[PDB]
Design a protein around this ligand. Structure first.
Ligand SMILES: Nc1ncnc2c1ncn2[C@@H]1O[C@H](COP(=O)(O)OP(=O)(O)OP(=O)(O)O)[C@@H](O)[C@H]1O
Ligand SMILES: Nc1ncnc2c1ncn2[C@@H]1O[C@H](COP(=O)(O)OP(=O)(O)OP(=O)(O)O)[C@@H](O)[C@H]1O
Lengths: 544, 544
């Protein structure tokens, strides 16, 4: 669609104030643009002093009023630009935070962060000068319709100059757009490269691969600068084609004005005043054209920021919801669930689980069987394509995600810790939870002993992805967080689905499922599985 | 301090060509600034046609030559700016990749990316189109001495205008700098928060947090735009003062010139041509003052990059390398080694670890004893304290870090994968290694099977953080990579140091070290360590 900023609807009064101030400003400018005519035709050509001082003082007062009214519209336009830029950035950030998981696994962090950071633009194209120049271009249309009365042929020449400007801008419409798009794409790729290199640097500084990374970054920077030089060449071509027209048109204006003066009609002071009126007719237009890089860059930034990440399907746009579900204690009843990650290969075949309520079910299989795939399916990070997962007799499709992702706690290997207070880390999601509950969950997660050892026991900072604490001391914070988010289906009288790789820790479990070709081949407790001479028996005898 | 003469000393012919072209350009501009003097006082006041056409054509030719010179000077200036930017940017990037690990563990990924973007700002701001205007200030000095030659009465007023410009810039240099610094700091903080949120959006979705993070990002954006508004107010005050001075000075010039014409030195040329010449004395200065915010922004960004650049690398510290060490087949001899991450608390104290050659020793302890700290100290990621690490009988402090990183392989549980080809992921540091060693290291690491089952075998593409592979499948890639980097002191007849949190895998280790309270309390083989009624005994009986 079209990303037209409708945020100005609550800003109706400000726009009217700006427009009226600009109208009076241009009116005073044109009124004060007769000073040189007053000088040459009447003040000195008649040899009359003691009134030139009065005229000069009056025009100084007029210019002071012009500055006073240009100190106001600039402030108002800056406020409008702030109020638009903040709103558009917040829209984009909320939408990206509510996007599905396929988007986040099929894209690089650099692309998203660069698409956001391309918001200094748009703002720079709606700043004070950039938009007051467009308003003054309209005011220059008004000044030109005034200019038509003040001599005719010179207004025709000015119109021809405007036509030349229009042709020049039209011919250079696409190239600046494409150059900006390509430089933005290359800058996004470079930003992703730096984000990856600085994020994981233990591997680089561990394998002695600084030189290779530097060479790859040099290639990316070389591409960025080549695509920047292309834009520079197009910009210099545009600036030259505009400067030629402007200067030669001004010289033609002076030549034709002299030609008129030495041929009866019109006067020299009329020509001198016509130069300043022609300034208020052309200089806004030429200033706008010289701003075409800024407007074009902002248009490209708003197009990329809105093409995707403002049109892509959201998370909540999945299905309907329900009101009868208030608790999530039930029997999970996978029916022929098939999940394919993208398009590579079906991770899960026609799987079938019969997890009872409040059990301690364990899941085993090959290293690439898809256990974490099952855990992600149960958390609605993804969706099946032919089957129907259920809980308590009703499908989890028809349950509000704010309930599924609140009553199911899932702890994984990729423990992620946020920058902030340990209490703030623990109380993510439900911030209002009191000290007693976080203490209880920490004690139940064995993390309370560690936390009380640190100085500023719970009120201590954790830097970025946990560095103030060891990796084994962050799995326990993940456990404590999952315990705070009081669950009904716990994935590692609440149902516990433990996914583990060692066959010795999960033995005394109510039921154990084993999946090899996606589907479950064997099930039951440990004793019956051992008394089967099956795949689980082979695994147990090999790992004994 | 941050001088670009290092990247500018090679570029001298370009600078000479730019300066000479600019000199001819301003000379032709001053020559063309006599058109109106020729027009009124000689071509109009004498009523002579034809010669008017000839002079108009001549001045059109002069202006065309001016444009032809400005084209080349702009091309050369943009080439110079591009080269300077690339050079400084790569200096910063190489320095940051060579920085120690304390810096990377005490900073955020957002800050580095923001400073790199500020280097890009240095590119766009100052050295892209504005060096053609800084020269014009000196060329305006030339035009001003010519103005004094032309008429000494109005040169005093022009000098007073220049003095007012200077006072305004002097009194507005500081607040613009401070506002730019504050907006850059706040934008860096916003970038850090955003990269943390988008990078680690697993916990935000799982628990449900795309309201708290949204509120925090809204607060950060509000602070960013508050600083932006402060900068905007300072810029508007600057622009208003400059506009008042310029406009009122121009009107005073016109008034005083009319007074001179009626009361002394006269004719229209000495005013109409004087203003055209003044366009080559005051207009470049006003353009420079208008560009001053951009120059100050570039200066602040260069200051931040220089603040990063002065930080010592890893090679600058830990000097006195050695050349007589070729292999790392020796006895690790931790002697009274102490360590302390920053200033929190010593995680190690007087450790007397004495690993022999070629064994398969294991290190065990509590959940925060410091096993991975020992691995980092031996791999030489962090700086030890009183005492030193010995390998092959000599200290580790005097060994080429390249040899250490290429001869000690560390396999940590925070496995990191790079967004590239699988073969490129495997060969990190030594790209020339043939596929035979790749296959051998994969088969020895059991990672060959799943790689072979990938859709595009050993040269498949991987997303960031190995999102295209399972958590178990990613660690086997780390094992295969560390095996490719043929080690001698491999940490998980080469010495093997196994860090494990269990007690059943290490029953076959040659020796077992028990890191409990900073030091090593007990050591030996499994059987003798069980026959010690010590801390390992209670650990074994509790885990049984
Ligand atoms: N994010 C992903 N995108 C695409 N394919 C994926 C992704 N994650 C896993 N796969 C694929 O799914 C299969 C197994 O995935 P999964 O992580 O569920 O396995 P797993 O057996 O549960 O893992 P592990 O036991 O090692 O934790 C493999 O074929 C793997 O390549
Ligand atoms: N980069 C760091 N900065 C500050 N403190 C740290 C850092 N890394 C670890 N610590 C802390 O210092 C101690 C050292 O932890 P370390 O990572 O060495 O433990 P570990 O033996 O690997 O434990 P685990 O059983 O959790 O794997 C811990 O108390 C930890 O919280």
């Amino acid at each position: 669609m079209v990303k037209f900023a409708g945020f100005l609807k609550p800003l109706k009064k400000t726009v009217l104030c700006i427009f009226l101030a600009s109208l009076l400003y241009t009116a005073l400018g044109i009124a004060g643009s007769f000073y040189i005519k007053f000088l040459f035709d009447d003040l000195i050509k008649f040899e009359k002093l003691n009134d030139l001082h009065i005229i000069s003082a009056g025009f100084a007062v007029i210019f002071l009023l012009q500055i006073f009214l240009n100190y106001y519209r600039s402030i108002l336009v800056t406020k409008l630009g702030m109020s638009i830029d903040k709103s558009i950035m917040m829209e984009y950030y909320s939408h990206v935070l509510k996007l599905p998981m396929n988007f986040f696994n099929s894209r690089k962090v650099g692309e998203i962060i660069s698409r956001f950071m391309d918001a200094s633009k748009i703002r720079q194209a709606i700043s004070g000068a950039t938009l007051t120049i467009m308003i003054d271009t309209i005011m220059a249309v008004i000044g030109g319709i005034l200019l038509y009365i003040q001599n005719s042929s010179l207004f025709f020449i000015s119109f021809i100059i405007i036509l030349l400007y229009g042709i020049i801008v039209t011919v250079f419409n696409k190239p600046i757009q494409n150059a900006n798009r390509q430089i933005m794409e290359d800058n996004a790729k470079l930003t992703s490269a730096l984000v990856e290199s600085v994020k994981g640097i233990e591997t680089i500084k561990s394998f002695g691969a600084e030189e290779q990374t530097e060479k790859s970054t040099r290639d990316k920077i070389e591409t960025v600068m080549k695509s920047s030089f292309k834009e520079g060449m197009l910009y210099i071509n545009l600036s030259s084609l505009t400067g030629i027209v402007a200067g030669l048109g001004g010289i033609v204006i002076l030549w034709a004005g002299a030609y008129n003066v030495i041929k009866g009609n019109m006067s020299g002071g009329q020509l001198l005043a016509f130069n300043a009126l022609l300034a208020y007719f052309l200089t806004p237009v030429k200033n706008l054209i010289d701003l075409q890089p800024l407007i074009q860059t902002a248009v490209v930034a708003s197009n990329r920021l809105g093409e995707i990440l403002e049109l892509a399907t959201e998370k909540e746009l999945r299905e309907d919801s329900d009101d009868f579900v208030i608790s999530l204690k039930g029997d999970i009843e996978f029916r022929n669930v098939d999940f394919r990650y993208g398009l590579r290969k079906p991770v899960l075949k026609n799987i079938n689980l019969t997890i009872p309520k409040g059990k301690t079910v364990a899941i085993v299989g090959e290293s690439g069987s898809g256990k974490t795939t099952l855990a992600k399916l149960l958390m609605n990070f993804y969706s099946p394509e032919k089957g129907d997962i259920l809980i308590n007799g009703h499908s989890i499709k028809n349950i509000s995600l704010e309930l599924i992702r609140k009553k199911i706690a899932f702890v994984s290997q990729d423990v992620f810790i946020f920058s902030g207070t340990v209490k703030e880390n623990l109380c993510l999601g439900n911030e209002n939870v009191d000290m007693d509950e976080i203490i209880k969950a920490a004690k139940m997660a064995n993390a309370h002993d560690f936390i009380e050892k640190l100085p500023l026991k719970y009120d201590t900072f954790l830097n970025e992805s946990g560095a103030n604490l060891s990796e084994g001391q962050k799995q326990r914070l993940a456990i404590a967080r999952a315990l705070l988010k009081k669950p009904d289906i716990l994935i590692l009288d609440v149902t516990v689905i433990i996914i583990a790789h060692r066959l010795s820790t999960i033995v005394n479990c109510d039921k154990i499922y084993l999946l090899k070709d996606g589907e479950i081949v064997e099930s039951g407790s440990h004793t019956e599985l051992i008394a089967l001479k099956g795949c689980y028996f082979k695994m147990w005898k090999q790992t004994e």
